[PDB]
Design a protein around this ligand. Sequence first.
Ligand SMILES: [Zn+2]
Lengths: 70, 65, 69, 78, 233, 75, 82, 73, 81, 135
Amino acid sequence: PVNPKPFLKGLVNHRVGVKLKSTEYRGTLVSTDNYFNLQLNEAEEFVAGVSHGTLGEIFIRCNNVLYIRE
Amino acid sequence: VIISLRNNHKIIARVKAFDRHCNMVLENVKELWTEKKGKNVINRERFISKLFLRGDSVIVVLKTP
Amino acid sequence: VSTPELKKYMDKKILLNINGSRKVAGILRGYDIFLNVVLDDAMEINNHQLGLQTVIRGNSIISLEALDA
Amino acid sequence: VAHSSRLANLIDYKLRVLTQDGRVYIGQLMAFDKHMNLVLNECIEERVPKIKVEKRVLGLTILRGEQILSTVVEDKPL
Amino acid sequence: SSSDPSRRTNILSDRARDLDLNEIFTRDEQYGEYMELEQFHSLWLNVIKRGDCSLLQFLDILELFLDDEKYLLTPPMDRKNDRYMAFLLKLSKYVETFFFKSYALLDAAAVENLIKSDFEHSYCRGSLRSEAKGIYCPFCSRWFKTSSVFESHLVGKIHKKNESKRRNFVYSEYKLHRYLKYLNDEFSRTRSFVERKLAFTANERMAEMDILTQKYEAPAYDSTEKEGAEQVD
Amino acid sequence: MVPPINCIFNFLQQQTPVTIWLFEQIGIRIKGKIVGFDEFMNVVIDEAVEIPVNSKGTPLGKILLKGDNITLITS
Amino acid sequence: MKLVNFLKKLRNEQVTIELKNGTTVWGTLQSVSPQMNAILTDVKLTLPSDNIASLQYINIRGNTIRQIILPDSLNLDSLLVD
Amino acid sequence: TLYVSQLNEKINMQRLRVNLFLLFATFGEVVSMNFKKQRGQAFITMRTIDQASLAQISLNGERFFGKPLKVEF
Amino acid sequence: NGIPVKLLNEAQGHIVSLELTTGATYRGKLVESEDSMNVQLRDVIATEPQGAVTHMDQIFVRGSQIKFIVVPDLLKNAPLF
Amino acid sequence: MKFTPSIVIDAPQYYVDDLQLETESMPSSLKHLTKPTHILDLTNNDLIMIPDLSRRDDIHTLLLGRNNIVEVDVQNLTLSNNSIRRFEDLQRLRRALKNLTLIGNQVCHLANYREHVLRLVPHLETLDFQNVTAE
RNA sequence: GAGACGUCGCGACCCUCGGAGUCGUUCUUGACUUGGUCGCUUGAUGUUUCUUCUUCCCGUUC
RNA sequence: AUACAUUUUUUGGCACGGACGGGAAGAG
Ligand SMILES: [Zn+2]
């Protein structure tokens, strides 16, 4: 029953982490679209599971994304 | 605002234009990278007045208050 | 727009040469306009099978070279 | 070389061509595309191993635009 | 005259048939009309490590070098800064080559030697004097009470060091100064151009560019010129 | 013929051990159960497990792996 | 809305261009396609620590061009009008 | 066009043609196969006819790669 | 529509050569081609990027991963152009 | 009839049987060819010395038949029917060259002419249309 | 610098031996077909693993 | 005569006396 887009929608205003094409991320999701571009707050940059820096307010481009996770 | 990029270029710059592709016209442009030989540690950055940018390059844009 | 004419290769074992210098084998069961492949399961090239049936994405295929003539 | 506006207007000129892999295709542009694919009349792939120019004559070549980087004019027509 | 074509197409003599100005002047210079300083505005942005500086504010900076004292006592940057001295070198070289480029007919060697002698006999000899602070030194960037202490300072280890390290830069600065003075009319002309283009619209700027281009890629002698149409008086 | 979409649907219906390969990434694989379906190859896959490939096992939660970086499916 | 339009409007500009492979390209933009395929004239190719190679005409593809370094003087707001 | 025969057929085709071009360029601006039928022969084509006649008379029996070539129109 | 595509189609039957992104040249009779250069070929040799060669029967290739295609020089004559 | 820029610009240009230019007392002003030719045909002219060339990276074949070459200041050099008379005049070719032809030059009849060329210009593989052999 | 694995060459005791072409219809077109082996006695070239000095000669540059 | 970015193209999986050259000999 649960498709991806609705899951994504649900997960707005909640913690998420993103891997890339590689470095892990960690932040609260602000909003999403059809193309799967992201906008996050309280972004922390997990360099292979090592929080290098806390950027805060960020916007991730879709094509570099690998997966979403809580 | 600062932008992370595919080729390891931290683009600190003033945004002018914006579109579907996340291409950007940029003023007050200050890129940050590192030209290095193996076992070489150098940190380089250059000022540019006006600069167009392509969107596939962009990984993550960010805003430092 | 047009369908990939792989009706010749239907129900035959094919070497799906796939992205990153890898390989797959298996009998061809189906496909679509994007060239995704649905195939009965076989090994990844010494050798080890995973799965009962398998689905390969379109983008990933370098080649699908026919094992059977 | 002349001072053209577009690629289409300079049809059948001898062309240097660069591709993402680093090879250099040289030959006369017979036909262009919506996606910059090129037909080349007498095509020669020229490659450089990591020294000096290695050379291969191909012939009539359809060249995909994905792999094309940039095109340059080698000479005039004929 | 006209030694190249069949009859009358090229003013150039057979002697200099392969003489081409476009290989000496860029399009933005318009054969000496303007001097292209945008490039140096770029490099300058790279030098100041910011963007607070506009093309016009940069030209405002250059103006300092028209004065005999400003470029020395009110420097854009600290005159002992590396980036700055390098920039100044490149710029100076440009201005000089432009100068002699735009005035072929004047004896280059004469001018060079004149400037050099002015540099040795006056500039480095306390040419800058103030009734209050005394005598300024380009190399040490310090003043001096009287000429006496000034002279006995020109043998000191400090001044030896400096005059021995920053000589080329000081000299280049000076050249930038005097050559920019000799080109005041061109400097003004360009600054004007800048303000104009700046106050254009899109179509306007485009048509203007078209004009500069045409002037650049046009025959020096048209098939439709006059020969022997002299008026009297 | 059995289309890919149909296969995906079947898998979803089942809820079976799915082992996904990554595009242009040999060393890593995913192992879970398909929950979602999209017009593209993208899906959501709860109870996923990241795997380092034999040239063990690693902890991982619920994930949607993006359609562009998929390679293999099996279910 | 469109940056394509803006690009088109930029005509006859002597500009540097930067590629995905880092090649610095000094040339006069005679035209650009709807898909960013740059057509230069009076072109000068340099790498990012080695010697220069100059060329008369270069048609560079849109996918390659990372960053077009714009001219010194430019009114951007005006350009951005439809 | 001049027809040459009695040529050393051991020379590779591309080398034969390039030496033929070189040798015959001296008379004016200038087809050879290795089939059984055509081996040891070549057709050399010149822009000018006077060039062909001069070539024929001056190189009759010229030692080329060891053998005396025989030329004819 | 693309004239290169047309050319490719025409080359059907003929012995085309064909390199990929990988750099693995093939030569063979072109069986079928599509708008997207989704080529099939018969009786096809396959060179590795390093050097070694391998004979093979009926290769399929997806145009995405194709780099350049060499067609025989008779087609320069017509009839597409 | 000086070899001039104007002369080179109206000269027949074609693909030979390589890109070749069809061409004088003195070799000069080659700059104007812009290094665009693989071959240059200077046959039947009055050149005295093979000299005066600009840097030409393309140029691989020089056909210099029936001129008056008596001194020398590149893979193939055809000098048939010229005026080279002393073995020592051929010395400058050591600094280049695989195909060399010097037939119909007085130098040809000098004792040991062939062996002299072989030792002084070892890079030559074919001399006067005959294979340089090991023996 | 050395070991594969290929791909195109100097010699030979060897082998081997002599766009074009045809037709239907009409004053010009449409169809159908189409060097190999051994050495190198130090030939040329990619992949792919591992680990330079001294002397003499010939050429460029300052 | 009255025109647009989510698998096949262009939103990319990209990136990290002194030198020089050749040839020969002798040593490790
Ligand atoms: Zn002092």
